[PDB]
Each structure stands twice: as C-alpha cells, then as structure tokens.
C-alpha cells in the first residue's frame, strides 16, 4: 500500500496535543461577550468573518500529519455538538482540549488509560444527571427572549424578533432565516401555503402592479397529469364562468392547446383564470397536490387508482380559496375552505410518517408539507450593508434560533459557566472502584472550571480568581462578563439551554477520553 | 482539506493593515483636483489609465495571503459604494483605512472590539442623520451643471453637455454614453423611434439622394410571422393603392414571392411600398412590434392568441405615420398617430415590469423599449485622439453623469469634505453607554477629517492645518483645492450629492469596523 | 485574480521612460536622409529591413513589465499616426519621448500634471492653428513630384513614377503597389474592370493570337449560382444569337451539361459565347458580381431573396460591354454601359465602408472592389533582386504615395522640421491661466525643435546648433540635411504635407501628455 | 546652469568680442565691464596639459593589464 510512519509514546502524545491546542486556541477567542471574530480565507472571494466555533474548526487543517490528527478529532467534537444542538461548539472545544491535556499528563507506566476513560464517563453521567435536576422548564415568553439575546452575543433586537416570531407561529413552529436586503431585520409571517412556481403564460396578470395575478374567492382545479386538450379543460371553465368566480389551474403542466384556450378567453371578454404547474418534482407532488386538495376541499384528478377524470367535474369537486396571489416565480394560496376536521387527520398521518422513517431527504420534504399547511411559517430577513457583515450577523442569528428551540423542549440553567460549576459537589460523593477511575473523576472535576475561566480570560480579568469567588458565593450568583461584576443570573437574564450544555460536555468527554488511551500513531508518508 | 496556516493577535493585524494601507495609498492619489492618474497593466493590449477608485482597487491583488485579505475587504467597500451610488469610491477607501488603522491601535487586552463596533455604528447613524438635516434639494439647472462639473474633475464642458442633455430630455430621462470618433464631444438627441434594420430590396429607393426610401403620411402593416405568399399580402396593398398613400411592411421577413410582388408593383406604375424585417431577435420582437403598433395605431398580425390574419385587413387596421425614412441598415418611424392616452398606459406597464424583475438582459431590452418609445433619449459621443484617452474621459463622464442623477433624487451638500467636517458637532453630544462605545465614537470623530485632509495633502499643502482653519471658520466656508484658498462653496460651485457622501461613509464604516474585531486569521498554504 | 506588483512615484516614472527612451532611441536613427535601416528578425524566414517607424515600433516588445508600458504607449502613438495619415511615424515618436521626458521632470510635489496636460493641449491647438495659416495648397504637378521624392527618402525615380501615375488616373484615383518581379519599377495603367480568372474551355479562342477570346458589343450574363442544366442556359443564348451579339457568361461555374452546349454551338456554326467563373471566393463574389452588374447594367441571377431565375431572362436584363478580352488566367471588361450616376453612388458606398471598419481582410477585398470597379487604375510593380530589398523599397513607395495623397487634399508646408520651428512665435503670445499651464506651453515650446534637431544629429552634425541658426534666419531658409548647407526650401524642393505634420504632433501630444500624469503603476507578476 | 549648451555657445560666437554668458544672472553681458575674467596662465596650462596627455591616449592600439587575481 502506501508507505507509513509510526510514532510511540510521549512523542506522539505531544504532537497530537500540539494539534489540539492550536485549533482550540483559535476558537477559544470567540467565547462569550468580549470574544473576538476570526477571519477565514475563502479560496475564491471575499473572506468569512465568523464567531461560530465550528466554522473556525472545520477550516483549520494542518500540514503535519500528527497535529492534523489532533485537529480532526477536535473538529469531530465541534461538529457532533453542532448537529445535535446547534450552539455551544466553543464550549465543547475548550472542554475537549482540557480533557486531552489533563489526560496526557496522568499517563505513566503503571496507569491504565482505558480505566481512566471509564472513570471520566462515570463522572460525566453524574453531572448531566445533576444538570437535569437543577433544570427548570421555560414558561414565560420573556425567558425565550433572554435565551435568544444571550446566545446571539447580546444583541437585544434579535431576542425580541425571535420571541415575537415564536409567539405568532408556536414554540415548535417553523422559523427560517434568509439573506435580507434592507438595513434592518424583518419578521414576515407567511399565511397559508406557497410553492416556488409561477404562472405559465404572462397574460394572466390582472394586477397592473408588480407582475401579479390576484384573485379573491376562486375555485381550484388540481390535476395530477397534464391538461393537454381543449376537451378536458372546457367543463371546469364552464363551471367557473357560470358561478362567476375566477379559477386557478394547478396541474403537472398546461399543454399549448388548452393553454391557447385559456389565454384566448382571458384576453377577450375576460374570463378570470390562471395556470401553474405542480410544486414537484416527482412522487412528492403526488402527495403535495393531495395536501393542497384537502386543505381547500376538492379532488386531485387523474389519480392512479381513483383516476378522477377532468371531463366530469362538479362545483363541489373544485377547491375554494378566499384569496389567490401568483407572481412570475411563485404562487400563494391563503384561506382554503378545506373542512379543518380533515386537514388535521392529514397532519397526523404525515407526522406518523416521519416518526417511522429517516432518510435526511424524505424527512426533509416531509417537514416541508407540515409547515406549508397549518400555522404559517416565519422568515427572518436580516439587515446589513455589505455581504461579509450579513453572513456574520446570520451565523449569530441561527445560533440564537437553535438555542431557543433547544430550550423550549429541555429547560434552562444558569449561564457563564455557572451551570457546570454548580455540579462539582455532585462529583465529590462518587466513590471510585479503583485508583484509575478516581483519576478520571478528578480530570472532569478540573475540567468543569474551564468555561467560566475562559470567559473571564477573554474579558481581560483573572480567570481562576473569578471562578473561585463564584463557587464561594451563593447558588444563584455568578459572573456577568460584560458588566464585569457578580450578579444573580435569572433576575439579570443570563441563562443557557440545558440541552446545549450537556451535549457539548458529552461529545467533548466522549471523544477526548478516547484520545487519551492512545499509545501509537500511524500516519501516511508526506510524499509531496 | 487544504493545509492551512493561522496567525494570532498583533502579528496578523499588522499584515492585514499593510494590505489595507497599500491598496489605499494606491487609490488615495486619485482624489480631488490635483489628484493623479494610475496606469494599470492590461493583460492583452495597451494599458488603462484611470482616476476612478474601483478600477484601481479591483485591479490590485496581492501575493501574500494576509495582505490580500486586507486588499479584498477594501475592494468590497469600493465596490459596494460604486454599485449603490456611482461615485465616491476613493472617499470610501480612505475612510475605510482610517477606521482600520485607528482600530488596530485601541485593541488592548481589556478592550472589547465588538462594543467598539457598536459605538462606531452609533456614531455613523447620528452623522448620516445630520447630513440629512443640513442637506438641501437640487432645484436650479445651474446646480445640475455644477454637480456634473465637479465630479468630472473640474471639466466644465462635461458639466454643460450633461446639463444640456438633461434639460432637453428630463432630469430622469435616458442619457447614454458611447465611444465617440470625432475630436469633440457631441450631444445627439434621438427624437422618435428607430431600429437597426434596413429595407430588403434596393429598388424601393425613391429619393435620388443617399440611398433612402422616404415617405410622408404612410400606412403601416405589422406582421409577427413571415409574409410568404401573394395571398396574404395582396389585400393590404389594395388598401394602400386605393387610398393612394405609401405603405411600410414591418414583418419577421418578406418571402421571395410576396417580395417579388412588392418589387414588381414598385418598378412599374409606381405603387409606394417598402419592406423591413423585425427588430429582433426572438421573444423580444413580439413585444416590440406590439409597442410599435400602439405607437402608430393598429394591430400586429398573426399574433399567437389573437392571430389577427393578413387576409382580412382594413384601413383602420393599418398604422399611420407622418413621415418614414429607411436606409440600407436602419428604419425610423417619427410621428405615429397613436392615441397618446394609451401609449402612456403602455409606458407605465413596461416601467413596472422592470421594477419587478432583473436579469441584466430582460432589463436591458426592457429599457430599450422605454427609450425607443418615450421622450427622445440623449446620447453622448466623446471625442479624443487616441483610445486610452477616450476610456479615461469616459470613466469621468459616467462618474459625472451618475452624480447628477444621485443629486436630483437626494439633495446636495457642501464639498471638499466640508460635508462631513460640518457633522462633528453632532458627535460631540453623543452620550456613550460605556467605555468601549466611547472609543468608537472617537474613532469616527477623527475619521471625519480624513477626506478634506487627503485633498489638501494631494494639493501639496499641510493637510490638518487646512482642516483646522475650516472648522474655526463659518459654516459655508471651506477649501477650494484648485484655487488654493478659502471660499464660500455654493456661490463658488463646490457641492456633492448627499447620497454619495452617506453611502461612501456607510459602506466603509460597516466593513472596516468588523475587520477591527478580529483576533485570528486562517489562510491557505501558498504551496507553489 | 492574478498577483500584481505596484510601484509608486519617481521609481515607476523612471522605468516607463526607460522603455520610451529605448523604443524611441531605436527609431530615431531612421529619420530624414542619412537615416539608417533597422533589421528585424522574422520568427520564420529572412529578416525585414525597414526604415518605417511603425514596423520598428510594433516589433519591439520588452521583457520588464514597466519598460513595456512605456513601449506600448509609444506604439499607440506611432500606430494612430500611421492609420490617420500614412507617414510621419518617426516624427511622432521623438515628439512623444520629448513630451514624456520633459514631463517626467517638472513633476514636483506642488505641480498638477492634469493642468500641465491642459496647457500642453492648449499649446498643440494653437500650433496646429498656425500650420494651417502658413499652409498653401498644392497646385502644380511638380509639387506632387517633390512631395513624393522627399518622403521616399530622396529617390527621384519614385517621384516621377508617382507623379506620372497620378496624372493619368487623377489625384484622387486608385494607385496600388505590388511585389514586382523585374529589376526596375513599372507603371501599368489598367483600363476598365479585371479579375484574375480565365475562360473555362480553351475552345472559345477566336483570336488566332496569344490565346485570347476577344469580343465587341457583347451581352453579359451574371449568375450567382452554377449554370447546371441545359434548361437554364438556352434562353440567354437565344437572346444573344437573336440580336446578333456575342455573350459572356460569368457564373459561379458552368456545369458540363450547359458547357457541352456552349462549346458545341461554338465549334459549329460559331455562336460567339465565352464563360468564366466568378472572382471569388465566398461571400465577396456575392458583392463583387453585383458591383460588376451595375457597372454594365443588368441583374445577377439566382439571388438569395430576389431569386431572379435564369429561365426568364430579357435583353435589357443582360449587361452590355463595349469590348471583352479573356485570356487563360484573367478576364477584362472595358466599357460597361452601366448608368454611371449610380456606380458613383456605389463607389461612395464602398469607400465609407472601409473608413468605418478595418480587419486586414474585409478592408483588403474592400479595396479590391474599388479598383476593380473604377475606370482605369495605376499599379506599381517594384523591381529588385531579393525579397528583403523589395519589401524595403516597397515600404518607402507607400509612404511617398500616402504623402502625395495627403498633400493634394490638405496643403503643404516647409520641410526638415522647419514647419514646426516656424510656429514657436505663436506660443510666445499665449497667456497661461496658471503656473501649470505655463509649464505645459514650455514643454511644447521645447519639443518643437526636436525634429530638425534629430535630423541634424543623424546627419553627423550638432543638432541644436543647426536649430538655432535656422530660427535666426529668414522664414524660407533652413537646412538641407543631404547637401549639408542652408537653402530656400520650396525653390529647392523640400516640403511635407500639413496633414502628416499636424497629426504627428497631435497624436504624440495626446498620448504622452497623459503618460506624464501618472503616479502609480500596477503590473501583473512575471511568474515564469 | 540648466540651459542648452551649444545654443549659448553659438549665440556667443555670433556676438561681439567682449560679449558672452554670465551663467549666474543667466544672460549675455560685456565681461570686463561686468567682471568675469580669468588668468591667461590658468587657461593655457589647462589646455596644454589636457591636449598633451589626451592626444597620446588616442595613439594606442593595444592595452596590457595585470590579471585581477583576488
Ligand atoms: N453577557 C454575558 N455575561 C456572561 N456570560 C455570558 C454572556 N453572554 C454569554 N455568556 C456565556 O458565554 C458562553 C458562550 O455561549 P455560546 O453562544 O455557547 O458560546 P459562543 O461564544 O461560542 O457562542 C455561554 O455559557 C454563556 O452563558
Ligand atoms: N475643485 C475642488 N476643490 C475642492 N474639493 C473638491 C474639488 N473637486 C472635488 N472635490 C471633492 O473631492 C472629493 C472627491 O470626489 P470623488 O468623485 O470621490 O473624487 P474621486 O472620484 O477622485 O474620488 C469630493 O468629496 C469632492 O467634493
Ligand atoms: N533631404 C532632406 N533634407 C532635410 N530634411 C528632410 C529631407 N527629407 C526629409 N526631410 C524631413 O525629415 C522629416 C522626417 O520625415 P519622415 O517621413 O518622418 O521620415 P521617414 O518617413 O523616413 O520616417 C520630415 O519632416 C521631412 O521634412
Ligand atoms: F461557539 Be458556541 F459555544 F457555540
Ligand atoms: F474615487 Be471616487 F471618490 F469614486
Ligand atoms: F517614421 Be516616418 F515619419 F513614418
Ligand atoms: K462562538
Ligand atoms: K476618480
Ligand atoms: K523612418
Ligand atoms: Mg455559537
Ligand atoms: Mg470616481
Ligand atoms: Mg515612413
């Protein structure tokens, strides 16, 4: 195969620990307030300017093979935490390094690194079991605003926007962020359903405005397969013209012949119609048109084993929507009169359909159908003046938005590091089975101070001195690293999700305590 | 991934600031009168010779990875200002460097660069709020001549041509510049309609002059698809011969058969006809022939979903024009009797169709339809003796022309930098929330002096000395850097659009105050 | 993008001027009599041996990035002058360098190069305004003989040949030069039209002479596409035989079926016909046969969108010519009865088409159509024994021929440089607006002595001493650099076109006075 | 002095016998009246020492030099 190079013992430990220290010194500066950004060279355009501690970690790839092993294993810590919780990735990386450093010190000839690993995990289990006890559910809509304000680097506008969006959509609603264009942030609460597809012919525009077709109290014709002929399309339009209401035609496509009839009747006397294709792309639209059908109340035509055909339609067989808006790239149905008692049964089917399966894409479009249908979705167009700014402000908004959605399900706990500092008394009652498990528990006991310590450090004060004066203090008191003094937390509004705290700790301790059991390292030769 | 290299703290700050200082020293020389040109090597031919601070900034790309980071982020400022306002890009780059340099000094261990950022933006909000107070709208057509004269590097011919072109077309008309051929500048005001296409057969020439077919009070036949046969063409000519008026035939093409008919009846007894193809090329001509129709009063034949056919024409179904001029490469319709009340409704449609969309090509041919139809457009053929010369003057004409269109919409304000210098008293009443925001406000208070200071520096005098004596002086007094003495401004005619001043400041402060929050820089390894 | 390297201030100035000084030192040696040749290596064959200052300027491309910028900007001066006038390229380059050198000295910290530029152009405008006063039209045919003899480097045979060719064709006729084969120069005056293509079958020879087909008062049949079948050719012959006149058949080709008929009717009773293909090769013949048509009066058959077919011809539809001469390799039509008032409109059409465009091949075959069309034309087959000689002597003839045609339209003036020396008094009455415009006027005032000075220098004498002794002398007295003594000029026959003198000054002053405005230079890195 | 050399020399030789160039004021003057003079001894030895030495250098056809070892 490929020529390799092996290194044993303390030499390899040091080099890997050198790789860990570098990638963690790069990210540790981005912690808490008074943290500082990191500029990353993009290979093509203007550079990134981040504060998120995974963008910093996934970039840093080191030349040396052994230091790079350290970097990769810290990258995997930072990434496991991000996907699981969405914030707290700096918190994990400093905890990972601290367990690595303290581990590559206790490795003498008589020590057993694997029992040390077992002791670390006993300590970690005990501490996340202590977090859940001192956890408390988030109840008031003000605690939502605080969690957001904190994880957004203390930007209070962000906190009010995410709290407002979560009152008007539901705490488990669908908030999603976009690249805004204006200078300020905007909360847009979409009402109804909308799909990324516009009218076929630019003759349906009846608005004399920004290229819109706008209807009220329309019928809906849902077709699975194409509407080719003049034959299949005529009966529906006779219904629409007779009842004197507009008509929307959502089909796989409108062929040129039925299209030519639609355009004709629009331009003279002036029948009110409009056509758009289906949302797409394949098997999905077959479910989503059916979703559209029952949301409005009607039937999808051409169905496989029902094959409702177009030639025999009836006015109850058409859906009804209060307002219809269609532009050159997107259509919106708003107030479907769809017998809510039945659209709710649909919601229950789709939610059971996701609990069953997972494919990262079947579950993706699955959630698209839920959100599109009921409570409407919120979007957060962020302001800014230049690109790199918007991209920075956007990394902070998503970290705040993940924090709030991870807090509403699993409660809040003190911040500034005090969450973990208030767990050390839990470790002081463990009775280890042997000497090596005692070493592991002592490793975590030291490591729990790292978060509070690294925040004070970036603030410019003595880290460990602040950590001690916190522990001596009462249970609700800790350090506000912005104001630079000690405060009650919840009264002052410093809190963190318990989910982000425990997953960061658990992913760090998980990977770090395994690195420390190594004795050999095998690397590819660095040919050229 | 790619082997990377990280640098921390003061070392990295220094390297990026070196990249910034270089790219800004290169562009700063091109400021104000007595500014100086910059020769840029073009990779293929003779070099460019500019004074615009984006051609200078976008060209300069650096070898070192860290210096290039500084340069790229200054290109982004200069570019954001150009697209948003069209002038003021040097003003942006020097303001940017001043905010970076002043920022890479206050970064001690206890400073919070992110709060300093917040203070910088507090200062910028208050100052653009003060510019808007001391601003005034542009009213007299002498103020238009002045703004144009200033932004053209003090070339008064440019000021008179643009004011003349803007008086005869409207302050929001359509002026466009071209590479002239003569030695002097020319203002050509196209009045009416014209498209770049001539007659098919050189037998329609009835002029006994420079190869022209020239008619008065003619009919117009607008056909979308080809005129193949004798059958479809014959009825229109019977109308033309019966009423005894000439006829123009604007179609996609005139086939050899209908063509052989047209030439025959022209060469004997002497029916007055002439034919041309459509403007082109594809979907566009379909709208553009429709535009011509309502401009003259008639109907496009063969239309998709109207299919007005040629066999049943009627004399009212033909357009009418006062005079028709057709050469071997272009046709001009002048005085269409087209029911102006309806073509204005058309104009309003096309203007909303551009405000809605943008594709750089749909919006291109879109403006072609306004101009071709609307109040005659002005075109400016610039003189010169050699090519590199014309490209310089053309960079200056466009910056002069962009400035006037940014003054007519958003008012004017003092020039020479005095616009910003007259805002410092606004900053002196800010009450910063903490120490870090106070640092930011002082950063801006110093930076506001940079524009006036860099103009005096380029003039060969002491920069800060001129700045001090201006502030001591009255509100209308400041420095004329060409005459080299202090003057009232508006009476002397030194003014700038408020839009260019505010966007230059805002794009610089936005980008620069984020660079100064950095603590780490990660760059790809420079392999070879 | 590509890594670039910037240089500021005097360093950059020095290097560019080194490039200007190099490219201009190389060319100055080819000036006036006693100038000297320049050997250029051709990458493929035997080298060039020139005296023209554009062949020398366009070759020299420099290694260093900064020296090459200077070289290119002097190339642009020499090229703009050649295209505008056809001679005077050495005069321009020494004037360009002199303005560059004198410009890269006065650039101190307080000087404004842009105002110096304005003064330079004020001075150039005033001096080209003085040339036209002291200009006088060329009237006698001996002044033509002198203008030609001078710019041909004092070759008196060249002067007599060009004067003779211009007497027999008109001073604005079409003279054109070719690579002769003999040892001496030859003046051949073609009469009528001619193309390099002979009869198809060697049976049309009715001459009993040197292999010629010779007709008088013939018809002409012009076909764009081939004459394939017996069907298309017979009616034309029926007409030609009916009226009892010969017939010429100019088509893309005469296929073997129609050919066997033409030859058959030729060999028995003796119908007078003859066939030749078109001039060629592709799109050109489509225009060139049409040119031939209107010159004789008729129609080209098979046309694209007129498709005049061969089957329906008529005797007015055939061209008529006074005499027809066809050999084995070329055909000549002489006295086309073509309603000349329109071929003149055609000639004016083709002449404007070349002034508009240039492609070295569109303009090449373009000139083929003028001469082929015009009545008569002169050609000058130059002698010589080897190629490099002919290429040289041919370079001098064209410069003489451009000179005489530039004198007949715009008058003559004293020579040897004395034309400009006699303009300095105009500069001494300018009143400059400021110090910088004063600096510029002095730049030109110094620069006007350069031509006389560089000619005396090359003659082996002291340059400025000859310049001084001229200015003290009367207005008609100056220096004959061949005889080496002072003479009246017009009596002695040393004169230059005013068009060549003024364009030389103006293109140099334009470009150089812009180079002298530079303060930064941006160049691509020279990787490898 | 910053002017064209041979041009001043020509305008001097054209002039009268006492007229020449004062290079400080930058104009032509009578000399003794204005006070520009030099000893005849210094002029003649300068020419004679130069012409002597130089006119022998120009008679050379070969040059022999010691090798520049190091
Ligand atoms: N104003 C503040 N005062 C004190 N501690 C804070 C403040 N804001 C955030 N923190 C703490 O800093 C830590 C960093 O939060 P998180 O967003 O996970 O880290 P990062 O800075 O990497 O985003 C959290 O534990 C949080 O409690
Ligand atoms: N003649 C002048 N005297 C004093 N100041 C001037 C003069 N002309 C322009 N300025 C000022 O110089 C600044 C440069 O304007 P801008 O169009 O950005 O020039 P550049 O394009 O070189 O950057 C403006 O703020 C303008 O008001
Ligand atoms: N015999 C001559 N004596 C003095 N001056 C001359 C003579 N012949 C030409 N000249 C001058 O030399 C100048 C340079 O002419 P140009 O055409 O540029 O030379 P070339 O064509 O060889 O480059 C012209 O202005 C011309 O008047
Ligand atoms: F960088 Be944070 F702790 F997600
Ligand atoms: F360089 Be300018 F201020 F656009
Ligand atoms: F060099 Be010459 F005047 F064309
Ligand atoms: K972070
Ligand atoms: K500029
Ligand atoms: K020459
Ligand atoms: Mg984060
Ligand atoms: Mg500009
Ligand atoms: Mg020449």
Transcribe A58-116 into DSSP letters: HH---SSHHHHHHHHHHHHHHHHHHHHHSS-HHHHHHHHHHHHHHHTTS--SS--HHHH
| DSSP annotation string for B42-86 | -SSSSPEEE--TTHHHHH---SSHHHHHHHHHHHHHHHHHHHHHS
Q: Which residues of D touch C462 (CB under 8 A)?
A: 6
Distance between first and last Cα of chain C: 17
Map residue D16 onto helix, strand or coil. coil
Q: Is B87 annotated as a binding residue?
A: yes
φ/ψ of residue C202, rounded to 5: -80, 45
Q: Residue C191: is it exposed, middle or buried by C-beta count within 10 angstroms (0-12/13-18/19+)?
A: exposed
Across B185-223, b (16+ Cβ under 10 Å) vs e yields: bebeebebbebebbbbbeebbeeeeebbbbbeebbbbbb
Distance from CA of B388 to the nearest CA of A (A): 30
Looking at A132-229, list the stretches that DSSP marks H as alpha helix, in order from N- to C-terminal side: 141-151, 156-167
Going by the DSSP 8-state scheme, the letter that residue A244 receives in this structure is: T
Which chain B residues touch A29 with a CB distance below 8 Å? 519-520
* Chain B hits for C436, Cβ within 8 Å: none
Q: Do D6 and C465 touch (CB under 8 A)?
A: yes
Q: Could you tell me the distance, in angstroms and rounded to a whole number, from the CA of residue B122 to the centre of ligand 2?
A: 27
**Residues C317, A130: Cα–Cα separation, whole Å:** 109
Touching status, chains D and B (3+ beta-carbon pairs under 8 Å): no
Q: Which of A55, A159, A416, A497 to mutate to test the pocket of ligand 1 (most atoms within 8 A of CB)?
A: A416
Q: How far apart are CA B406 and CA B151, in angstroms?
A: 12
Helical H runs in B374-423? Answer: 387-407, 418-421
CA A163 – ligand 8 centroid, Å: 47
Q: Which of C84, C92, C150 to mutate to test the pocket of ligand 3 (most atoms within 8 A of CB)?
A: C150
Nearest bound ligand to CA C461?
3
Q: How remote is the CA of residue A496 from the centroid of ligand 4, in Å?
A: 11
Burial of residue D30, with CB atoms counted within 10 A of its CB: 0-12 exposed, 13-18 middle, 19 or more buried: middle
Four-CA torsion D20, D23, D29, D32, nearest 10 degrees: -80
Cα atoms in the 13 Å half-sphere on the side-chain side of C509: 28
Query: How many helices, marked H, and strands, marked E, lie in chain A?
Result: 19, 18
What lies within 8 Å, CB to CB, of D48 at 6+ separation is: none
Least CA distance to B67: which residue of chain C?
C3
Please, what is the Cα angle at A518 between A516 and A519, to 5 degrees?
Answer: 130
Q: CA A325 → CA A169, A373, B33, B475, distances in Å? A: 22, 16, 54, 54
Pocket-testing residue among B36, B38, B53, ligand 5, by greatest number of atoms within 8 A of Cβ = B53
Residues with a beta carbon under 5 angstroms from ion ligand 12:
C 52, 87, 399
CA–chain centroid gap for B230, Å, is: 48
The residue contributing the CA closest to ligand 6 atom 3 is C88
d(Cα C465, Cα D12) in Å, to the nearest integer?
12
Report how far apart the first and last C-alpha atoms of chain A are (Å, whole number).
Answer: 17
Nearest CA to ligand 4 atom 2: A88
- In angstroms, this model's resolution equals 3.7
B260 vs B263: CA distance, rounded Å:
5
Name the residues around ion ligand 7, CB cutoff 5 A.
A 30, 51, 53, 90
D49 is in an annotated binding site: no
- Among left, alpha and beta (phi > 0; psi -120 to 50; other), residue A32 is left
Q: How far is B250 from chain C (nearest CA, A)?
A: 16
Residue with tokens 């051609």: B55
Cα separation, B76 vs B54, whole angstroms: 10
Ligand 6 atom nearest C53 alpha carbon: 1
Residue of D nearest to C446 (CA): D4
For chain B, the chains sharing at least 3 beta-carbon pairs closer than 8 angstroms are A, C
Distance from CA of D4 to the nearest CA of C (A): 8
Element (H, E) at A223: strand A213-223
The CA distance from A220 to A331, in Å, is 13
Task: Tell me if A263 and B305 make a contact (CB, 8 A cut-off).
Answer: yes
- Would the CB atoms of D11 and C465 count as touching at under 8 Å? no
- What span, in angstroms and rounded, lies between the C-alpha atoms of C8 and C518? 9
Calpha distance A486→A464 (Å, rounded): 15
Q: B319 pairs with which residues across the strands?
A: B220
CA B351 to the chain's CA centroid = 17
Query: Given an 8 Å threshold on Cβ–Cβ distance, is C464 in contact with D7?
Result: yes
Strands B175-178 and B378-381, how do they pair?
parallel
The β-bridge partners of A412 are: A136, A497
- Distance (Å) of CA C64 to CA C15, C68, C339: 9, 6, 61
Min Cα distance B427 → chain A (Å) is: 22
Experimental method: X-ray
Q: Is C170 in the pocket of ligand 3 (CB under 6 A)?
A: no
B-C CB pairs within 8 A amount to 114
Strand runs labelled E in A266-390: 273-276, 300-301, 319-326, 331-333, 377-381
Phi-psi map region of C258: left, alpha, beta (phi>0 left; psi -120 to 50 alpha): alpha
Q: For residues B155 and C118, what is the distance between their CA atoms, to the nearest angstrom?
A: 10
CA pair distance D37, D24, nearest whole angstrom: 14
Closest Cα in chain B, distance from residue A66 (Å)? 13
Specify the residue with its C-alpha closest to ligand 4, atom 4: A88
Residues near C474 by beta carbon (within 8 Å), at least 6 away in sequence: none
Q: What is the DSSP letter of C254?
A: B
Closest ligand 1 atom to Cα of A87: 18
Q: For residue B164, how far is its CA from the centre of ligand 11 (angstroms)?
A: 22
Helix ranges, C381-434 (H) = 387-407, 418-421, 424-427
- Chains A and C are in contact, defined as 3 or more C-beta pairs closer than 8 angstroms: no
Tell if the CB–CB gap between C465 and D4 is shorter than 8 Å.
no
Quote the crossing angle between the two packed helices A463-472 and A450-459, to the nearest 10°. 130
Which residues of chain D lie closer than 8 angstroms to C465, CB-CB? 6-7, 9-10
Binding-site residue ranges of A for ATP: 51, 87-91, 416, 496
Contact at 8 Å (CB) between A31 and A94? Answer: yes
Q: How far is C467 from chain D (nearest CA, A)?
A: 9
Interchain CB distance below 8 Å, D4 and C462: no
Question: C289: Cβ below 6 Å to ligand 3?
Answer: no
| CB of A383 sitting under 6 A from ligand 1 | no
Task: Find the C52 Cα to ligand 12 centroid distance in Å.
Answer: 4
* Pocket of ligand 2, beta carbon within 6 A: B 30-33, 35, 51, 53, 87-88, 90-91, 150-151, 154, 399, 415-417, 451, 455, 480-482, 494, 496
The rounded Å distance from CA C103 to ligand 3 centre is 26
Q: Which helix (H) or strand (E) holds C143?
A: helix C141-151
DSSP string, C40-92: E--SSSSPEEE--TTHHHHH---SSHHHHHHHHHHHHHHHHHHHHHSS-HHHH
Could you tell me the distance, in angstroms and rounded to a whole number, from the CA of residue C36 to the centre of ligand 9?
8
Report residue A399: phi and psi, to 5°: -65, -35
| Alpha-carbon span A402 to A405, nearest angstrom | 5
User: Using a 6 Å CB cutoff, which residues line ligand 6?
Assistant: C 52-53, 87-91
The span from the CA of B255 to the CA of B237, in Å, is 16
Name chain A contacts of B4, Cβ cutoff 8 Å. 41, 59-62
- End-to-end Cα, chain B, rounded Å: 17
DSSP state of A47: P
The atom of ligand 3 lying closest to the CA of C88 is 18
- Is there contact between A and D if contact means ≥3 C-beta pairs under 8 Å? no
Give CA separation, B49 vs B41, B181, B388, B470, C440, in Å: 9, 19, 7, 33, 20
**Distance from the D9 Cα atom to the nearest Cα atom in chain C, whole angstroms:** 9
How far apart are the C-alpha atoms of C514 and C121, rounded to whole Å? 10
Closest CA to A467 of A444, A438, A446: A446
Give first-to-last CA distance, chain D, whole Å. Answer: 43
């Amino acid at each position: 195969g490929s020529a390799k190079d092996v290194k044993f013992g303390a030499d390899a430990r040091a080099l890997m620990l050198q790789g860990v220290d570098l990638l963690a010194d790069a990210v540790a500066v981005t912690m808490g307030p008074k943290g500082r950004t990191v500029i990353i060279e993009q290979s093509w355009g203007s550079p990134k300017v981040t504060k998120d501690g995974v963008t910093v970690a996934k970039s840093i790839d080191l030349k040396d093979k052994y230091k790079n092993i350290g970097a990769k294993l810290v990258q995997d810590v930072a990434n496991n935490t991000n996907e699981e919780a969405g914030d707290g990735t700096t918190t994990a990386t400093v905890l990972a390094r601290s367990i690595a450093k303290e581990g590559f010190e206790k490795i003498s000839k008589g020590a057993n690194p694997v029992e040390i690993r077992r002791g670390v995990m006993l300590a970690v289990d005990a501490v996340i079991a202590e977090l859940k006890k001192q956890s408390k559910p988030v109840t008031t809509p003000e605690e939502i605003a605080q969690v957001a304000t904190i994880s957004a680097n203390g930007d209070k506008e962000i906190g009010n926007i995410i709290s407002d969006a979560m009152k008007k959509v539901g705490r488990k609603g669908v908030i999603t962020v976009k690249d805004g264009k204006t200078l300020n942030d905007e909360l847009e609460i979409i009402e109804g359903m909308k799909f990324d597809r516009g009218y076929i012919s630019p003759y349906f525009i009846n608005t004399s405005k920004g290229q819109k077709c706008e209807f009220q109290d329309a019928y809906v014709l849902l077709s699975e397969k194409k509407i080719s002929s003049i034959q299949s399309i005529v009966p529906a339009l006779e219904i629409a013209n007779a009842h004197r209401k507009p008509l929307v035609i959502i089909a796989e496509d409108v062929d040129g012949e039925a299209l030519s009839t639609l355009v004709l009747n629009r331009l003279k006397v002036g029948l009110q119609v409009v056509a758009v294709k289906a949302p797409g792309f394949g098997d999905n639209r077959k479910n989503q048109l059916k979703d559209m059908a029952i949301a409005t109340g009607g039937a999808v035509f051409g169905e496989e084993g029902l094959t409702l055909n177009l030639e025999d339609v009836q006015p109850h067989d058409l859906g009804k929507v209060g307002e219809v808006i269609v532009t050159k790239d997107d259509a919106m149905l708003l107030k479907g009169k769809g017998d809510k008692a039945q659209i709710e049964k649909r919601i229950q089917e789709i939610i059971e359909q996701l609990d069953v399966t997972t494919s990262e894409y079947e579950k993706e479009k699955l959630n698209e159908r839920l959100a599109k249908l009921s409570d409407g979705v919120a979007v957060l167009k962020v302001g800014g003046t230049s690109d790199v700014e918007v991209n920075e402000k956007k990394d902070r908004v998503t970290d705040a938005l993940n924090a709030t959605r991870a807090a509403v399900e699993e409660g809040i706990v003190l911040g500034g590091g005090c969450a973990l500092l208030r767990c050390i008394p839990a470790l002081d009652s463990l009775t280890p089975a042997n000497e090596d498990q005692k070493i592991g528990i002592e490793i975590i006991k030291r490591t729990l101070k790292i978060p509070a310590m690294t925040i004070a450090k970036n603030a410019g004060v003595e880290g460990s001195l602040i950590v001690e004066k916190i522990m001596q203090s009462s249970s609700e008191v800790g350090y506000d690293a912005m104001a630079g003094d000690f405060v009650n937390m919840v009264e002052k509004g410093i809190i963190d999700p318990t989910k982000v705290v425990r997953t960061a700790l658990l992913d760090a301790a998980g990977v770090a305590s395994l690195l420390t059991t190594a004795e050999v390292v095998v690397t590819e030769i660095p040919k050229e």
